[PDB]
Amino acid sequence: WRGEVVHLSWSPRAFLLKNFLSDEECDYIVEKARPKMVKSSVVDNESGKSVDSEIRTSTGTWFAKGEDSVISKIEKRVAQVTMIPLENHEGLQVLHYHDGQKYEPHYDYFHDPVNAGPEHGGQRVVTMLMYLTTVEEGGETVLPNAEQKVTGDGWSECAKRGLAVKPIKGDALMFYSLKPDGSNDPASLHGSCPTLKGDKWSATKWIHVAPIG
């Protein structure tokens, strides 16, 4: 892969990859994902148990690593660009938001004593968010603790609360949950603004500091 990369921010460290995925890839992934979609879950900050929460109202599913030719190419592309080996990557998570669905601002790094355990590949360091559709109204990735907020037209009010990224088909957002020294980066607070008009389909790669297993 090689495409235009737009530096979004340093705090947090955020980069937008233009045309990361082909339309054809985006379409394929949504199609495989549709039948398997269920309510998304979060982990309790203290316990690490996976639970249902008003916080997060998408549906999602998972693809195991290497279980599909199309996604395997993408997988390798994500390892290439992040410069972290495939062993450290969670499976592909596909998500859907529509009709008010959202994900309130949160951190991808774990607070709990279980989920950033050695067995689990240690802490989450970087996330790739691949937008599989272009969203008419809302569904921006918002980073409220960014150094620089967006303003003017074509951004929801939700999105003016931070630095924000309009979901566009084929684009991917890369951002770091950790500083280069491995400390938590609180500047990396992020969410998904309510999707108002449109079906927001995205895919994520949550990559750890160490091999999962």
């Binding site: 998304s40 979060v42 998972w62 949160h106 709990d112 989920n115």
Partner: peptide, 6 residues
């Protein structure tokens, strides 16, 4: 909170 793992 954090998205549930793989």
């Amino acid at each position: 909170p954090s998205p549930s793992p793989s």
